Amino acid sequence: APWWKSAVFYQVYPRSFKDTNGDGIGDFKGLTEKLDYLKGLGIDAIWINPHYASPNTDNGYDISDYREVMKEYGTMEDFDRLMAELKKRGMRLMVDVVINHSSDQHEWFKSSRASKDNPYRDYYFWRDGKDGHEPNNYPSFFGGSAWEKDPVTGQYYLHYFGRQQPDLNWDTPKLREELYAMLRFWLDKGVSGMRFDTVATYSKTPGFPDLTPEQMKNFAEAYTQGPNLHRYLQEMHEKVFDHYDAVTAGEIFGVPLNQVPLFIDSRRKELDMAFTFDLIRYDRALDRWHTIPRTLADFRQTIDKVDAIAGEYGWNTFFLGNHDNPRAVSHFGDDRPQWREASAKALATVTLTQRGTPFIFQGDELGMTNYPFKTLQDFDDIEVKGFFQDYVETGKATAEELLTNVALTSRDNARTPFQWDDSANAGFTTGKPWLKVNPNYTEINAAREIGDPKSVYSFYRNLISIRHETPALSTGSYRDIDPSNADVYAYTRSQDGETYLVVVNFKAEPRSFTLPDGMHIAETLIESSSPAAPAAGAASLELQPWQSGIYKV
Template sequence: MSQPSSSNSSAPFLTTLRASEANTPDRRRWWKEAVVYQVYTRSFCDSDGDGIGDLPGLISRLDYLQSLGVQVIWLAPHYDSPNVDNGYDIRDYRKVDPLQGTMKDFDRLVEGLNARGMKLIVDIVANHTSDQHAWFRQSRASRENPYRDFYIWRDGRDGGPPNNYLSIFGGSAWQKDETTGQYYLHYFAREQPDLNWENPAVRKEMYEMMRFWMDRGVAGFRLDAICFLSKLPDLRDLTLAEMESLEHVYVTGPKVHDYLQDMHREVFAGRDLLTVGEAFGVPFDETPAFVEESRGEMTMVFHFEIVRLGRHDWQVQDWTIKDLKAVLRGEDTSSGPEGWLTSFLENHDNPRSVSWFGDPSPKGHGPSAKALATMLLMRRGTPYIYQGQEIGMTNIRFDGIEDFEDINARGIWDNTVGIGKMSAKEVLSSLSKISRDNARTPMQWDGTSRAGFTTGVPWFRINPNHTDINVAQQEADPGSILNYYRRLIELRATHQALIYGTFEDVDPDHPSVIAFTRTLEDEQFLVLINMCGEKEHYILPHGLKIAEVLIDSTSAQAADVLPELMPWQAGVYRLAPPADI
C-alpha cells in the first residue's frame, strides 16, 4: 500500500468550516440526532407460522430494537397489496395487509414504540398504486369515468405506445388496456400505474391519507420515488442518451417542487416530522432545493451514489476507495447550508454492504462489518440501519433465475437473456451481486433450522450462513458486530460533534484508508478506517495527533493505534489540541 499523498499533509486543528447555523446544537432536531432502523416486515419476524413476517412479530422484537439504541423504526409498506412488488404496489392505503396483521396490531406497534420512547415512520408510495386499487379499477372502466384522470392515459402512436419511455424495471413504460384502447403510464411494473399529480383530486386524496396515518401516531414518512411525481411536458420522446439514465430524466419534471411544497403546506407544516425522500436520480447540486428548511419540502433525502458505487444500472463495474471517498465528500456538501443528510449503506433495494464493500469470508466478515459500521454511524447525517446489517448479514447464493423472487431481476433477465442479447452466465454474475433479493432474506435471529424467523415455511430462502451469523450468537459475544453497533450508537449520542460537527476528509488521496474529522467548537475527533484486508503502514496527516481512543474495532490503545493499521481496523479518536502537538 502506498503512503498518504504529501499534497494533503496539512490539516490544522479547528480550521475547517464551521457547521452552518442551521446545523448546530442551537438548531437541534430530534430527527438529526436519531438513529433509524428499517424493518422490511415481510422478512423480519413471523408470529403465526405462515412464513411471512408480520406486525405482531415485529412487536415481539421491540425490546431487542430498543436495546440496540435506535430511536426510530422505518416500516416498509404495511398496506393491503397484491405484493407484485412486495408491498410497493398498494391496493388500499387505509388498510393493513392481512398478511401483516390488523389495524389493531398497527396501533399496538405505535403504543409499544411510544412506551419505549421510540417513534415510527412509514413508507408512502405516492407515485403509483396497484392496478387493483379501487381508483384504477374505476379509471380503466371507461374514458368518461370520474377517476379516469387519476392516472395518465394516452392514445397509442403508429400501432404502438404513445412514446418511447422505458420502465425502470425494463420494457416499455406504457401498457395498453383493451377496455378503452388507450395506454397507461407505469414507471415501474405494469401492475403499478403512475398517478396523475396534475389532478388536484389526486393530491387531496393523498394528503388526507397521510393525515390518517399521522392521526394514528406516525412521526414521519419515507417518501418512495417522490421525485418522479412530475412528468415531462407533453410526454415527449427521450433521446438515446436519456434512455441510458432514466432515473436522471424522470426526476426533471417541472412541477416536482410545486407538489412537494404543496404537500408540506397541507400536511407537514406545524408538525415536527421526519420526512425523507427517495432522491434516486437527483444530482448533488440540485439537492438543496429539496431539503433546505426555508423552502418547506422535506427534511432529508436518500442519495444512491454510495450504495450504487461500482454499478452501471444493474451491471457490475470496478471501483476504488478513492472513488468512495469522493462520493462521501460530494454527498456531505450536497444538502447546502440549511439542509440535512442521511447516511446509509443498505436498504431493501440494495445488496448487503459486507458483500459489496467488505469481505464476507470468515476471516474478513467481522472486521469489515465493523469498519463499515464506523463509516455509517460516524458520518454527518441521520444514520439508517437496515435489518440484519447490525449482525453483518451477507448476500445469498443464486444458481439460476429460478432462485430470484425480485420482479426487477426477472425483468432484467427477460430483456437480456430472454431475447438473446446476453448470456445467462454474464447476467447471472451481476444479478447475483446486485439483486434486491439479497436484502430480503429472512432475519437471522438464531442458528436453528428456520433462523428463529418462523415456525413454518419461509416465504423466501434463509441464508445458510445463519448458523454462524445470528443475533443469539452475537448477543453473547462482547466483541461481536452487534455489540460494536451498540457502542457506536451510544458514542454518537454522547458527543454533539459526532452529530452536528463538520466533516472533513483529511486524506482524500490515500488508496485504502478513509480518514475524516468531525469538528464542533473545541471538540475534534478523527475517524480512521482501513478499508482493505491487509495491514497498512499509515502516517497521520501533519498537524493531527491522537490523544484518546473513544472506540476501536481492535481494542487498540492510543499509543498503539499507529503507524500500523490492522486489516479493516476502524476507530474514533479524540485529537490533541495544537498546544499538545
C-alpha cells in the same frame, strides 16, 4: 437541533424480519415482539417498509388501499399495538409513503380505466398509442415499456415500474387532495416520520415526448426532471406537514446530485432529509445488474460531494444498505469468512460517524451477507423477472450470464429472512420462509452475537452509545483528510471546540496512517481489530487489516 439529526434509525423490512404464525412471512406481531431487541441495540426510531394492503407484485410498493394494513402483516389493531409499544419505549416510527403510483387493483384505477369520461380517469396517465405502438419510447424499471394498453378504452396507461403499478397523476388537483387527506390519516395516528418512495418522479413531462438516445441509457434521471416537481412537494408541505410534527425523508432516486439541495434545504419547506443513491450505486452499471469495480477514493469522494450538497440548511441520511441493494459487508467490505467480521465492524464505524442521520438496515448489525443464489428460480424480485424479459428473452444475454451478475446486485440479497438464532430457519419462522434463509445463519445469528462482547452486534451497540454521547459525531462538521487516498479512510468531526478523528483501513493488509501536522491523539474512544490503542499524544497510527477507530484529538 431537531431530534432526527441526532437519532439513529433502523430499517425494518417486515416481510423478512419476524414471522409469528408460520406462514413464512414476517408480520407486525413479529416486529412488536422484537422491539426490546432494537431498543437494546440503542435504536431511536424505525423506518418500516410499506405495510398497506397490497397484491405484493412489488412486495408492498403496489398499494391497493392506503387506509388498510397488509393482510400478511396483520390488522389495524396490530399496527396500533406496534405504535403503542414503540411509544412505551420512547421510540418513533417512520412509515413508507408510496404515492408516485398505486396498485392497479386500487379502486381509483379500476374506475379510472372504465372510460375516458370517468371521474377518476385523470387520476392516472392515459394516452393514445403512436405509430401502431406505445405513446413513446419510455422503458420501465421492471421490464419492457412503461406503457400498457388497456383494451377497455384502447389507450395506454403509464407505469415507470411494474405494469400493476400505474403512476398517479399529480397534475390533477383532486388527486393531490386525496393523497393529502390520506397522509393526514396516518399522521393523525401519531406517525413520527414519513419516507417518500421515488419522490422525484411525481412530476411528468408535458406532452410525453420521446427520450433522446442519451436519455435512454439513463432514463431514471429523465423521470426526475418534471417541471412541477418542487411545486407539488412545496404544496404537500403546506397542506400536510406544516400542520404536524413529523420528519420527512425522500427516496431521491435518479436525481443528479446538484439538484438535491432543492429537496432538503429547510428554507424551501419541502423535505427534511434525503436518501441519495450516488454512494450505494457508485459501483453499479447503468443497466442495474452489472458491477463496476471502484476504489476507496471513489467511495470517499462520493461521500464528500453528498456532504457538501447538504450545506448549512439541508440534511442527509446515511446508509450502506437497504431493501433495494446487496448487503453492505458484501458490497463495501469483504464477506469472506476471515474478513467478514472485521470489515463489517469497519463499515459500522463509518456508518455511525457520518454527518447526517444514520440508517441501519436489518441484519447488518449481525454482519449478514449476500445470498448464494444458484438458479434464477431462487430470485423472487420482480426486477429480476424484468431483466429476464429485457435481456434474456431478447437474446442480449444468457440465463447464466444474468444469474452470475445479478447475484451480486439483486435486491433479494437484502431480503433473506433475519437470522435470529441457529434453530430451524434461523428462528425467523416455524414454517417455510417466503425467501430462503442464508445457510450461514449457523454462524451468523442474533442469539450468538448478543452473547458475545466481541461480536459485530456488540460493536454496533457500543458505537451507537458513543455517537449518542458525542454531539460532534452527529451534527458536527465533516472533513475528509485526504480524498485521494484509496487505502485508509480518515476524516474529522468537529463541534464546539471538540474535534474527533475517525480512521478506517479498507485494505486486508497492514497500513500506516499519519495525522495532519499539528494533530495528536488525546483519547481513544473505540477500535476494531486493534491489538493496542495508540499512546496519548501520538502523531501516527499502525493499522491492522480492516482496522477502524474513533479518536479524540
